[PDB]
Tab-separated table of C-alpha atoms in Angstrom:
chain	number	residue	atom	x	y	z
A	4	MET	CA	-24.899	-5.069	5.348
A	5	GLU	CA	-21.147	-4.712	4.863
A	6	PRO	CA	-18.757	-4.827	1.899
A	7	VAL	CA	-17.315	-8.290	1.312
A	8	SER	CA	-14.213	-9.294	-0.593
A	9	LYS	CA	-14.489	-12.508	-2.476
A	10	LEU	CA	-11.037	-14.008	-2.937
A	11	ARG	CA	-9.978	-16.901	-5.054
A	12	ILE	CA	-6.416	-18.094	-4.659
A	13	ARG	CA	-4.870	-20.394	-7.240
A	14	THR	CA	-2.368	-22.973	-6.033
A	15	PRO	CA	0.715	-23.689	-8.032
A	16	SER	CA	-0.931	-26.773	-9.497
A	17	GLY	CA	-4.110	-24.996	-10.477
A	18	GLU	CA	-6.698	-25.642	-7.789
A	19	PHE	CA	-8.616	-22.850	-6.106
A	20	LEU	CA	-8.812	-21.828	-2.488
A	21	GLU	CA	-11.868	-19.693	-1.874
A	22	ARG	CA	-13.001	-17.519	0.921
A	23	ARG	CA	-15.045	-14.444	1.487
A	24	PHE	CA	-13.767	-11.812	3.856
A	25	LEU	CA	-15.144	-8.666	5.346
A	26	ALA	CA	-13.640	-5.821	3.392
A	27	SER	CA	-12.814	-4.368	6.729
A	28	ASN	CA	-10.624	-7.321	7.651
A	29	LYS	CA	-6.906	-6.769	7.885
A	30	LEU	CA	-4.695	-8.402	5.271
A	31	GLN	CA	-3.253	-10.520	8.055
A	32	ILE	CA	-6.535	-12.442	8.042
A	33	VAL	CA	-5.964	-13.389	4.403
A	34	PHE	CA	-2.409	-14.459	5.233
A	35	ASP	CA	-3.824	-16.652	8.013
A	36	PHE	CA	-6.121	-18.370	5.551
A	37	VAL	CA	-3.446	-19.210	3.097
A	38	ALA	CA	-1.186	-20.392	5.861
A	39	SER	CA	-3.937	-22.638	7.081
A	40	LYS	CA	-3.963	-24.277	3.663
A	41	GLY	CA	-0.249	-24.834	3.488
A	42	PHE	CA	0.805	-21.750	1.613
A	43	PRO	CA	2.168	-19.265	4.142
A	44	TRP	CA	2.966	-15.685	3.303
A	45	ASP	CA	6.649	-16.026	3.892
A	46	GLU	CA	7.024	-18.957	1.503
A	47	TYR	CA	4.547	-18.076	-1.257
A	48	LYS	CA	3.829	-14.930	-3.223
A	49	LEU	CA	0.267	-13.819	-3.774
A	50	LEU	CA	0.249	-12.345	-7.221
A	51	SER	CA	-2.483	-10.097	-8.464
A	52	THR	CA	-3.754	-9.210	-11.903
A	53	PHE	CA	-2.180	-6.291	-13.724
A	54	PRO	CA	-0.648	-4.311	-12.539
A	55	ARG	CA	1.120	-7.083	-10.973
A	56	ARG	CA	1.839	-6.920	-7.382
A	57	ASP	CA	2.652	-9.329	-4.639
A	58	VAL	CA	0.178	-8.843	-1.870
A	59	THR	CA	2.407	-10.580	0.635
A	60	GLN	CA	4.607	-7.517	0.481
A	61	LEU	CA	1.896	-5.199	1.716
A	62	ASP	CA	1.233	-4.003	5.189
A	63	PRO	CA	-0.464	-6.777	7.029
A	64	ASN	CA	-2.346	-4.356	9.212
A	65	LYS	CA	-4.103	-2.574	6.342
A	66	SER	CA	-7.673	-3.458	5.482
A	67	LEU	CA	-8.592	-5.255	2.305
A	68	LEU	CA	-10.435	-2.132	1.275
A	69	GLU	CA	-7.374	-0.011	1.838
A	70	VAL	CA	-5.174	-2.245	-0.226
A	71	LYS	CA	-7.803	-2.434	-2.933
A	72	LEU	CA	-8.535	-6.139	-2.670
A	73	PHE	CA	-12.236	-5.597	-3.119
A	74	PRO	CA	-14.719	-6.790	-4.192
A	75	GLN	CA	-13.405	-9.683	-6.219
A	76	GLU	CA	-9.871	-10.746	-6.669
A	77	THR	CA	-8.170	-13.804	-8.009
A	78	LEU	CA	-4.594	-14.190	-6.721
A	79	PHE	CA	-1.939	-16.695	-7.875
A	80	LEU	CA	0.363	-18.472	-5.486
A	81	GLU	CA	4.016	-18.752	-6.456
A	82	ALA	CA	6.828	-20.115	-4.406
A	83	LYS	CA	9.362	-17.654	-3.166
A	84	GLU	CA	12.885	-18.405	-4.384
């Protein structure tokens, strides 16, 4: 058994992208997922619950566990200006 992070990512219009990730995965892997769905890290913020933080500004080589995106997180996509 390993720790898993369950992520839900809300698109600007209100639909949800969902994937489970090993908590050991690097954040890059989460960036890859959103990119794959049309919402790349360089174009869209990934906003967390309070305290608010944009996960696209974190170190992409850090694990989900290290950046505290575990075990369940809903993130909101928002276009970068």
